[PDB]
């Protein structure tokens, strides 16, 4: 061993070791304050967190319009009571809004017999309407009731008179807000006189009750100046129009159509839709149908869909259907009029287990719209690419970025993305992780390089890359 001696040490230790034992305690203590002062400098030189905006409930997720209750469920259980059983399927879609059709006993172009305070007996009454509002609140799903008064006549808003039916809606704003609905919608407001003046009066009563109440207005005008004339006085108004309902057969037509709306409205919160009361199989073929669901879930704003847009329900596929209200294909027993006319991949039950169906892509895009922070309120920055295609980036302060590349052409075009005029906060790296694609044939989770990105026809893919220094 190597032990000296308790008594031998103190006569051989510290002749001049007493000075080198104090020079190490002082050097320890000066290096501990130079370490503490060096950590305050690094902490205050860190940039800051960016403040999270005050999000409402319609900012986080998508809305779901149910125009016809009898055709959404089938005639065998067509009521407000049968709608309560379908709240589990709508919770699987992760939708937040329940814009359900008007139920207020219109009498086919008669102003004197149209009471917007009384429910039509073919749907129910206030006893099972209140049961629907309570059971939907448990699953965090808000109910929006629309009050277009002449909803079963040829022209809405009762074209024989103007302000008797305007005060009819104004009494119904304060009555249904007492019962606990969470919003309102008015359609076909191009058939109004003083349309831009009545929307400001109705949004007063909606926001004066509470700030968590919504008002939606719908037109059919597809031009930019008629839309901006309604939104120059109103700002917290969702306006569902037919603005994107053109062809878009080239990519820079839809790129210039989106980036002109956000430039003219000053990057406010907007609504993204193909129509106001109509499905996606109108205006679109079936091969551009998954490409438009990826775009509507990754644009800055609220996406609004009709019922039967997650399964790709075509109204012209089955004969003998009204195009304004087709039946919902729940099972193979959902259309018993013509036997053996519907398949298994054309149905909710068959697409629910298929991992490459349209309902599976809808659920895989709806969950990431509702939880990723740079898709909820991230910034938007589109950039240029090849001959025809659309590319953009969604980014927030320090969360994970997203990159969407959409090919609207018909040949195997290469991407050719340049990062020149992107901001240096969220410029793109050399490799990005793939998250999904609309067509199969790519391995998901693979870091693939963005310098050589060849793309298929009608192909859209979603990438993501982290915040780097």
Ligand X SMILES: *[C@@H]1O[C@H](CO)[C@@H](O[C@@H]2O[C@H](CO)[C@@H](O)[C@H](O)[C@H]2NC(C)=O)[C@H](O)[C@H]1NC(C)=O
Taking CB under 6 A as the criterion, the residue among 13, 31, 208, 447 binding ligand X is: 208
Taking CB under 8 A as the criterion, the residue among 70, 398, 414, 439 binding other proteins is: 398
Round to whole Å and give the CA distance between 455 and 406: 9
Residues 345-364 within binding reach of ligand X (CB under 6 A): 345-346
Q: Is residue 17 part of the contact set for ligand 3PH (CB under 6 A)? A: no
Select the span of 27-35, 58-66, 150-158, 365-373 touching ligand 3PH (CB under 6 A). Answer: 27-35
Residue with tokens 């919770």: 91
Round to whole Å and give the CA distance between 166 and 202: 10
Q: Is residue 420 part of the contact set for ligand 3PH (CB under 6 A)? A: no
Whichever of 2 and 285 has its CB closer to other proteins, that residue is 2
Select the span of 25-33, 87-95, 203-211, 383-391 touching ligand 3PH (CB under 6 A). Answer: 25-33
Whichever of 248 and 312 has its CB closer to ligand X, that residue is 312
Residue with tokens 């040949």: 411
> Residues with Cβ < 8 Å from 115, sequence gap 6 or more?
104, 105
Q: Is residue 189 part of the contact set for ligand X (CB under 6 A)? A: no
Select the span of 20-28, 40-48, 131-139, 388-396 touching ligand 3PH (CB under 6 A). Answer: 20-28
Q: Is residue 204 part of the contact set for ligand X (CB under 6 A)? A: yes
Round to whole Å and give the CA distance between 268 and 261: 10
**Minimum CB distance to other proteins, residue 89 (Å):** 15
Q: Cβ-count burial of 446 within 10 angstroms (0-12 exposed, 13-18 middle, 19+ buried)?
A: exposed
Mask of contacts with ligand X, 237-266, x by CB under 6 A? --------------------------x---
Taking CB under 6 A as the criterion, the residue among 10, 21, 268, 349 binding ligand 3PH is: 21
Q: Is residue 167 part of the contact set for ligand X (CB under 6 A)? A: no
Round to whole Å and give the CA distance between 214 and 146: 11
Q: Is residue 46 part of the contact set for other proteins (CB under 8 A)? A: yes
27 binds, among ligand X, ligand 3PH, other proteins, none (CB under 5 to 8 A by kind): ligand 3PH
Q: Is residue 209 part of the contact set for other proteins (CB under 8 A)? A: no
Please say whether the beta carbons of 332 and 347 come within 8 A: yes
Whichever of 45 and 75 has its CB closer to other proteins, that residue is 45
Please say whether the beta carbons of 434 and 459 come within 8 A: no
The candidate with the shortest Cα–Cα distance to 469, out of 429, 418, 434, 435, is 429
Taking CB under 8 A as the criterion, the residue among 11, 39, 54, 424 binding other proteins is: 39
Q: Is residue 200 part of the contact set for ligand X (CB under 6 A)? A: yes
Q: Which residues bind ligand X (CB under 6 A)?
A: 190, 200, 204, 208, 220-222, 263, 312, 343, 345-346
Q: Which residues bind other proteins (CB under 8 A)?
A: 1-4, 6, 9-10, 12-14, 17, 20-21, 24, 28, 32, 35-36, 38-39, 42-43, 46, 48-50, 52, 371, 397-398
């Amino acid at each position: 061993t190597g032990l000296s001696k308790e008594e031998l040490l103190k006569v051989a230790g510290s002749p001049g070791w007493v000075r080198t034992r104090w020079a190490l305690l002082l050097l320890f203590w000066l290096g501990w304050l130079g370490m503490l002062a060096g950590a305050v400098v690094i902490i205050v030189r860190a940039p800051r967190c960016r403040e999270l905006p005050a999000q409402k409930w319609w900012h986080t997720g998508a809305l779901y319009r149910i125009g016809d209750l009898q055709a959404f469920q089938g005639h065998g259980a067509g009521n407000l009571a049968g709608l309560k059983g379908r709240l589990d399927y709508l919770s699987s879609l992760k939708v937040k809004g329940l814009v359900l059709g008007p139920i207020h006993k219109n009498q086919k172009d008669d102003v004197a017999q149209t009471d917007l305070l009384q429910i039509d007996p073919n749907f129910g009454s206030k006893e099972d309407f209140d049961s629907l509002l309570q059971s939907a609140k448990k699953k965090s799903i808000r109910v929006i009731l629309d009050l277009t008064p002449n909803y079963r006549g040829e022209n809405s808003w009762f074209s024989t008179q103007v302000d008797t039916v305007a005060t009819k809606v104004k009494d119904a704003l304060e009555f249904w807000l007492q019962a606990g609905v969470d919003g309102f919608q008015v359609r076909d407001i191009e058939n109004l006189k003083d349309a831009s003046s009545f929307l400001a009066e109705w949004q007063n009563i909606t926001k004066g009750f509470s700030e968590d109440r919504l008002l939606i207005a719908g037109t059919n005008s597809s031009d930019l100046q008629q839309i901006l004339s309604l939104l120059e006085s109103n700002k917290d108004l969702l306006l569902t129009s037919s603005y994107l309902s053109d062809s878009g057969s080239t990519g820079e037509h839809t790129k210039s159509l989106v980036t002109q709306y956000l430039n003219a409205t000053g990057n406010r919160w907007c609504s993204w839709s193909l129509s106001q009361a109509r499905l996606l199989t109108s205006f679109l073929p079936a091969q551009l149908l998954r490409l438009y669901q990826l775009m509507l879930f990754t644009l800055p704003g609220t996406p609004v869909f009709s019922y039967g847009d997650e399964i790709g329900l075509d109204a012209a596929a089955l004969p003998g259907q009204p195009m304004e209200a087709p039946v919902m294909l729940w099972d193979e027993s959902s259309f018993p009029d013509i036997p053996g006319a519907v398949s298994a991949n054309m149905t909710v039950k068959g697409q629910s287990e298929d991992p490459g169906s349209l309902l599976s892509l809808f659920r895989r895009l709806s969950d990431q719209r509702s939880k990723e922070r740079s898709l909820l309120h991230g910034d938007f920055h589109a950039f240029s690419a090849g001959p025809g295609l659309f590319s953009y980036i969604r980014h927030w302060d320090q969360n994970e970025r997203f990159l969407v590349v959409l090919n609207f052409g018909d040949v195997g075009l290469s991407a050719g993305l340049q990062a020149s005029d992107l901001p240096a906060s969220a410029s793109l790296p050399a490799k990005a992780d793939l998250l999904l694609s609309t067509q199969p044939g790519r391995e998901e989770g693979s870091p693939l390089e963005l310098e050589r990105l060849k793309l298929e026809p009608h192909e859209g893919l979603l990438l993501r890359f982290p915040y780097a220094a």
